[PDB]
């Protein structure tokens, strides 16, 4: 039926602007009201504004008045949301959603169905940086070795092992957010401690946002 | 204005059991109320509108009821696709786009202990005048612990980062903690200890410069 | 000897929302109103000031067909001297009405599974509509005592609202399609006649 496809993820600097799209494959926006609701990380939903495509009129919530511009284009049936003067508090996932008009509410919106896939917008004063990879050396019958991928931005960094030949026993931890606004994760593999002198363990770290491809060998320590 | 307050915050429930979530409006909002389901890391989808009518495609095990100021959603035969966050929204009074705080419905799992692994600052990192101690916690439940660092036997938290517990691929949680010291602070004191408190249990690891 | 385009209005694919009723003008053609009256599938066919049986024997300068969509229990409002949300804020017929009101239940075309909220109506206005007046103003309606500043609020409503057309509603809430024929006889040669 009518389904909403949104734009891709965005990383922006403080003060800069961002503009998200939302195309309805249903051909016609018709007389539904397209609205934008943002969810900050780990927080609730927060309605930002609406626009009614057939009438061209938009309406914004008080907290966002002056920063949000919600617009619509009927020929391509695509709605847009432009948020300016970004802050860290604006880091969130932005969803678009159709809504019938009120069946007596007096208001230009009822319930929300369907929903857009969601668009992540990350706003941080940090700049693109490649990581540094260090060998977390080993030292029961099993041992743990791994790689430390520190001081990078932004996510995601992908960590494989032995060119893809070592997948069992792999645990790549979610990264942290240091006070400097730079991530750090580590990927640990637990392996038979009897093979520490014979088997070769090499971790392959890929940080696409900086074209960083790093191969680091993990050897034991005396 | 009209404030929607939900209960509980979280509802630990095993499959097959009946879960009952409550939404309470500060004012009388007739029977114009909507229930949305947000599976983890997914866009919400509308479960129920008009307090009781289920949305097209919504499974039968969901039933909305209530009116006036008291509303409930019942997930009768709780399946596995249903562990998610559930929100309620009134859309009669001003403003009709307020959402409830949300109620998390997670699976009830038996307690697990935090498997801790601690690593010393690698040789290549000390080579460049930085020290990081990595304290990796995994395979525990529920998703909440506490980390404390100590230099020898002197607790300190100068330059300590700590992940929030993130659920693994096996209904248990994981996290990590990173202590950024200098090579002097690593070599000037005799050892360093990471202490993970989970439901009372104070698991611990320690490392020394060698 | 061109036959008037009645299929254009009645057999049309989509109809207009009542707040913006669609007026098709009809002139320079020959009409057979008995064909329409004998389609026999219309749940409302009331002619005021004239009879459809003896209708093909008349000539008018123009014939206007105003089409729209409303809900069942509101069809009784498409008549002279009535009141309601529709006749007061959406489509007023004069008391001295010389014309016809035609309506049929369109629950199969205008009800999707899960709802059809594309048809709108006007719920608020400062004053009633004059006969055959039209309003599509989407200005915020001040229902309270406080100014609205063009933005919605408490007692500051949006004047248009949606129909919930579901295939399971009662007849009072099932969608009906309405065509209102008015016959204008001007000081000019008659261009719409019959046999
Ligand atoms: C509308 O179409 C039906 C069949 O599709 C036809 O029998 C009927 O005469 C048409 N009505 C008009 C007014 O043309």
Spatial separation of the C-alpha atoms in residues A34 and A108, rounded to whole Å: 10
Spatial separation of the C-alpha atoms in residues B88 and C28, rounded to whole Å: 59
- Considering only CB atoms, B117 lies closest to which of A102, A118, A144, namely A144
SS (H, E, C) A60-109: ECHHHCCCEEEEEECCCCEEEEEECCCCHHHCEEEEEEEECCCCCCCCCC
Pairing outcome for strands C29-30 and C192-193? parallel
Shared domain for C67 and C157, answered yes or no, is no
Shared domain for C34 and C70, answered yes or no, is yes
Structure tokens at A8: 């891709």
Q: What are the two backbone dihedrals, phi and then psi, of residue C85, each rounded to the nearest 5 degrees?
A: -60, -40
SS (H, E, C) C20-51: HCEEEEECCEECCHHHHHCCCCCCEEEEECCC
Spatial separation of the C-alpha atoms in residues B20 and B7, rounded to whole Å: 9
Q: Which helix (H) or strand (E) holds A42?
A: none
Pick the closest to residue B175 from B165, B186, B184, B185 (CA basis). Answer: B165
- Ligand 1 centroid distance, CA of A79 (Å): 39
Shared domain for B8 and B103, answered yes or no, is yes
Q: Is C153 on the interface with B (CB under 8 A)?
A: yes
Pick the closest to residue B179 from A202, C97, A178 (CA basis). Answer: A178
Pick the closest to residue A98 from A26, A44, A46, A45 (CA basis). Answer: A26
Distance from CA of B51 to the nearest CA of A (A): 11
Pick the closest to residue A189 from C136, B55, C182, B119 (CA basis). Answer: B119
Q: Could you tell me the residue range of the domain that residue A209 belongs to? A: 132-218
Place of tokens 């092992």: A161
Pick the closest to residue C179 from C122, C120, C88, C106 (CA basis). Answer: C106
**Last residue of one domain, picked from the residues A96, A123, A150:** A123
User: What are the start-end ranges of the H helices in B56-131?
Assistant: 123-126
Spatial separation of the C-alpha atoms in residues B122 and B130, rounded to whole Å: 10
Spatial separation of the C-alpha atoms in residues A197 and B50, rounded to whole Å: 67
Spatial separation of the C-alpha atoms in residues B88 and B48, rounded to whole Å: 9
For residue B124, the domain's CATH number is 2.60.40.10
- Contact residues on chain C for A51, CB-CB shorter than 8 A: none
Q: Is C151 on the interface with B (CB under 8 A)?
A: no
**Contact status, residue C160 vs residue C120, Cβ threshold 8 Å:** yes
Structure tokens at B63: 């039933």
Shared domain for A111 and A82, answered yes or no, is yes
Shared domain for A38 and A79, answered yes or no, is yes
Spatial separation of the C-alpha atoms in residues A201 and A218, rounded to whole Å: 6
Pick the closest to residue A203 from A163, A150, A174 (CA basis). Answer: A163
Residue of B nearest to C155 (CA): B94
**Last residue of one domain, picked from the residues B55, B75, B107:** B107
List Cβ<8 Å contacts ≥24 apart for A191-200.
A191/A142, A191/A143, A191/A144, A191/A145, A192/A141, A192/A142, A192/A143, A193/A138, A193/A140, A193/A141, A193/A142, A193/A143, A194/A141, A196/A138, A196/A143, A196/A220, A200/A162
Shared domain for B122 and B103, answered yes or no, is no
Shared domain for A139 and A119, answered yes or no, is no
Shared domain for A144 and A91, answered yes or no, is no
Question: What angle (nearest 5°) sits at the alpha carbon of residue B148, between those of residues B143 and B150?
Answer: 160
Atom 2 (ligand 1) nearest CA: C11
Length of chain B: 210
Shared domain for A88 and A159, answered yes or no, is no
**Contact status, residue A37 vs residue A48, Cβ threshold 8 Å:** yes
Pick the closest to residue A29 from A72, A85, A88 (CA basis). Answer: A72
Question: What angle (nearest 5°) sits at the alpha carbon of residue C49, between those of residues C48 and C51?
Answer: 80
DSSP 3-state assignment of C121? Answer: strand
**Contact status, residue B38 vs residue B85, Cβ threshold 8 Å:** yes
**Contact status, residue B14 vs residue B106, Cβ threshold 8 Å:** no
Spatial separation of the C-alpha atoms in residues A117 and A132, rounded to whole Å: 34
**Obtained via which technique?**
X-ray
Cβ distance C153 to B55 less than 8 Å, yes or no, reads no
Pairing outcome for strands C160-162 and C120-122? antiparallel
Give which of C111, C115, C158, C161 to mutate to test B binding, by max B Cβ within 10 Å.
C115
**Contact status, residue B64 vs residue B51, Cβ threshold 8 Å:** yes
Cβ distance C114 to B55 less than 8 Å, yes or no, reads yes
- Contact residues on chain B for C154, CB-CB shorter than 8 A: 1, 94
- Contact residues on chain A for B123, CB-CB shorter than 8 A: 137, 221
Spatial separation of the C-alpha atoms in residues A184 and A35, rounded to whole Å: 36
For residue A37, the domain's CATH number is 2.60.40.10
Structure tokens at A41: 């990380």
**For the CA atoms of B121, B127, B128, B129, what is the dihedral angle to 10 degrees?**
60
**Cβ neighbours of residue C50 under 8 Å, at least 6 residues apart?**
C58, C98, C99, C100, C183
Shared domain for B58 and B90, answered yes or no, is yes
Spatial separation of the C-alpha atoms in residues B104 and B102, rounded to whole Å: 7
**Contact status, residue A33 vs residue A98, Cβ threshold 8 Å:** yes
In sequence order, the β-bridge partners of residue A50 are: A35, A59
Provide the domain count of chain B.
2
Cβ distance A61 to B102 less than 8 Å, yes or no, reads no
Residue among C3, C5, C7 whose CB has most ligand 1 atoms within 8 A, to mutate: C7
Structure tokens at B210: 């060698």
Question: What angle (nearest 5°) sits at the alpha carbon of residue A66, between those of residues A63 and A72?
Answer: 100
**Cβ neighbours of residue B16 under 8 Å, at least 6 residues apart?**
B77, B78
Spatial separation of the C-alpha atoms in residues B19 and A185, rounded to whole Å: 37
Provide the domain count of chain A.
2
Would residue C69 count as lying in a domain?
A: yes
Pick the closest to residue A116 from A38, A26, A6 (CA basis). Answer: A6
Shared domain for A173 and A150, answered yes or no, is yes
Is the backbone of residue A179 left (phi > 0), alpha (psi -120 to 50) or beta? alpha
Q: Which atom, in ligand 1's list, is nearest to the CA of C36? A: 13
Spatial separation of the C-alpha atoms in residues A135 and B123, rounded to whole Å: 8
- Quote the DSSP letter at residue B126: H
**Contact status, residue A115 vs residue B43, Cβ threshold 8 Å:** yes
User: CA Rg, chain B, in Å?
Assistant: 24
A131 burial level (CB within 10 Å; 0-12, 13-18, 19+):
buried
Cβ distance B94 to C153 less than 8 Å, yes or no, reads yes
**For the CA atoms of C153, C157, C162, C163, what is the dihedral angle to 10 degrees?**
120
Structure tokens at B157: 């938290």
Shared domain for B163 and B131, answered yes or no, is yes
Q: What are the two backbone dihedrals, phi and then psi, of residue A80, each rounded to the nearest 5 degrees?
A: -130, 145
Shared domain for B139 and B179, answered yes or no, is yes
Spatial separation of the C-alpha atoms in residues C154 and B179, rounded to whole Å: 53
CB atoms within 10 A of CB B79: 11
Concatenated DSSP letters of B140-207: EBSS--EEEEEETTEE--TTEEEPPPEE-TTS-EEEEEEEEE-HHHHHHSS-EEEEEEETTEEEEEEE
Give which of A5, A98, A173, A215 to mutate to test B binding, by max B Cβ within 10 Å.
A173
Structure tokens at A35: 């609205």
User: CA Rg, chain C, in Å?
Assistant: 18
Please report how many Cα atoms fall inside a 13 Å half-sphere around the Cα of residue B172, on the Cβ side. 13
Q: Is C152 on the interface with A (CB under 8 A)?
A: yes
Spatial separation of the C-alpha atoms in residues A51 and B25, rounded to whole Å: 27
**For the CA atoms of C124, C128, C132, C133, what is the dihedral angle to 10 degrees?**
-70
- Quote the DSSP letter at residue C107: T
Cβ distance C114 to B56 less than 8 Å, yes or no, reads yes
- E strands of A127-209, at which residues? 132-136, 142-152, 157-161, 170-172, 176-177, 183-192, 202-207
- CB contacts under 8 A, C 100-119 vs B, are 113-114
Residue of C nearest to A102 (CA): C161
Spatial separation of the C-alpha atoms in residues B201 and B137, rounded to whole Å: 13
Q: Could you tell me the residue range of the domain that residue B188 belongs to? A: 115-207
Q: Could you tell me the residue range of the domain that residue C120 belongs to? A: 115-166
Shared domain for A180 and A119, answered yes or no, is no
Spatial separation of the C-alpha atoms in residues C98 and C48, rounded to whole Å: 5
Residue among C8, C9, C10, C31 whose CB has most ligand 1 atoms within 8 A, to mutate: C10
Spatial separation of the C-alpha atoms in residues B104 and B119, rounded to whole Å: 35
- Ligand 1 centroid distance, CA of C14 (Å): 15
Spatial separation of the C-alpha atoms in residues C120 and C19, rounded to whole Å: 7
Spatial separation of the C-alpha atoms in residues A187 and A8, rounded to whole Å: 27
DSSP 3-state assignment of A163? Answer: helix
Kindly list the distances between the CA atom of residue B184 and the CA atoms of A179, B130, B192, B204, C74, in Å, as whole numbers in the listed order: 22, 10, 13, 23, 85
- Identify whether C18 is preceded by a cis peptide bond (ω within 30 of 0): no
Provide the domain count of chain C.
2
In sequence order, the β-bridge partners of residue C57 are: none
Shared domain for A62 and A9, answered yes or no, is yes
Q: Which chains touch C (3 or more CB pairs under 8 A)?
A: A, B
**Cβ neighbours of residue A42 under 8 Å, at least 6 residues apart?**
none
Spatial separation of the C-alpha atoms in residues C110 and C25, rounded to whole Å: 25
C25 burial level (CB within 10 Å; 0-12, 13-18, 19+):
exposed
Resolution in A: 3.2
**Contact status, residue B106 vs residue B194, Cβ threshold 8 Å:** no
Residue of B nearest to C115 (CA): B56
Shared domain for C138 and C178, answered yes or no, is no
Spatial separation of the C-alpha atoms in residues A19 and A68, rounded to whole Å: 10
Cβ distance A101 to C17 less than 8 Å, yes or no, reads no
């Amino acid at each position: 039926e009518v389904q909403l496809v949104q734009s891709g993820a965005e990383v922006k600097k403080p003060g800069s602007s961002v503009k998200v799209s939302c195309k309805a494959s249903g051909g016609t926006f018709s007389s539904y009201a397209i609205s934008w609701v943002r969810q900050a990380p780990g927080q609730g939903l927060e309605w930002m504004g609406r626009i009614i495509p057939i009438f061209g009129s938009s309406n914004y919530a008080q907290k966002f008045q002056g920063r949000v511009t919600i617009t619509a284009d009927e020929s391509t049936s695509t709605a847009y949301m432009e948020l300016s003067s970004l802050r860290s508090e604006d880091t969130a996932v932005y969803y678009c959603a159709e809504s019938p008009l009120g069946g007596g509410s007096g208001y230009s919106v009822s319930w929300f169905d369907p929903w857009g896939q969601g668009t992540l917008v990350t706003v941080s004063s940090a700049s693109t940086k490649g990581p540094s990879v260090f060998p977390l050396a080993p030292s029961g019958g099993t041992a743990a070795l791994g790689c430390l991928v520190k001081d990078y931005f932004p996510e995601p960094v992908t960590v494989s092992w032995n060119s893809g030949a070592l997948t069992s026993g792999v645990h790549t931890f979610p990264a942290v957010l240091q006070s400097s606004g730079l991530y750090s994760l580590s990927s640990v593999v637990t392996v038979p401690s009897s093979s520490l002198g014979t088997q070769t363990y090499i971790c392959n770290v890929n940080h696409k946002p900086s074209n960083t491809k790093v191969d680091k060998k993990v050897e034991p320590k005396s | 204005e009209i404030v929607m307050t939900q209960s509980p915050a979280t509802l630990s429930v095993s499959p097959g059991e009946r879960a009952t979530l409550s939404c309470r409006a500060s004012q009388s909002v007739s029977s114009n109320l909507a229930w949305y389901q947000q599976k983890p890391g997914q866009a919400p989808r509308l479960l129920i509108y008009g307090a009781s009518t289920r949305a097209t495609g919504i499974p039968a095990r969901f039933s909305g009821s209530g009116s006036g100021t008291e509303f409930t959603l019942t997930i009768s035969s709780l399946q596995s696709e249903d562990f998610a966050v559930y929100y309620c929204q009134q859309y009669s009074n001003w403003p009709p786009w307020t959402f409830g705080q949300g109620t998390k419905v997670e699976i009830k799992r038996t307690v697990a202990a935090p498997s801790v692994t601690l690593f010393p600052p690698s040789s290549e990192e000390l080579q460049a005048n930085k020290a990081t101690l990595v304290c990796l916690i995994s395979d525990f439940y529920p998703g909440a612990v506490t980390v404390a660092w100590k230099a020898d036997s002197s607790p300190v938290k100068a330059g300590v980062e700590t992940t929030t517990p993130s659920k693994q691929s096996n209904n248990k949680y994981a996290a990590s903690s990173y202590l950024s010291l200098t090579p002097e602070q690593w070599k000037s004191h005799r050892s360093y200890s990471c202490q993970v408190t989970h439901e009372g249990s104070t698991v611990e690891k320690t490392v020394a410069p060698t | 000897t061109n036959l008037c385009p009645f299929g254009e209005v009645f057999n049309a694919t989509r109809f207009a929302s009542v707040y913006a009723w669609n007026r098709k003008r009809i002139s320079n053609c020959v009409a057979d109103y008995s064909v329409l009256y004998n389609s026999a599938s219309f749940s409302t066919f009331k002619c005021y000031g004239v009879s459809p049986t003896k209708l093909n024997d008349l000539c008018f300068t123009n014939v206007y067909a105003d089409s729209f969509v409303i809900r069942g229990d509101e069809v009784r409002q498409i008549a002279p001297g009535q009141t309601g949300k529709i006749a007061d804020y959406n489509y007023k017929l004069p008391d001295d009405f010389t014309g016809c009101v035609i309506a049929w239940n369109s629950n199969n075309l205008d009800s999707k599974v899960g709802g059809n909220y594309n048809y709108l109506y006007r719920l608020f206005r400062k004053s009633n509509l004059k006969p055959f007046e039209r309003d599509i103003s989407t200005e915020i309606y001040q229902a309270g005592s406080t100014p609205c500043n063009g933005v919605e609020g408490f007692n500051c409503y949006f004047p248009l609202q949606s129909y919930g057309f579901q295939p399971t509603n009662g007849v009072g809430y099932q969608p009906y399609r309405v065509v209102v024929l008015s016959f204008e006889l001007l000081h000019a040669p008659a261009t719409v006649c019959g046999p």
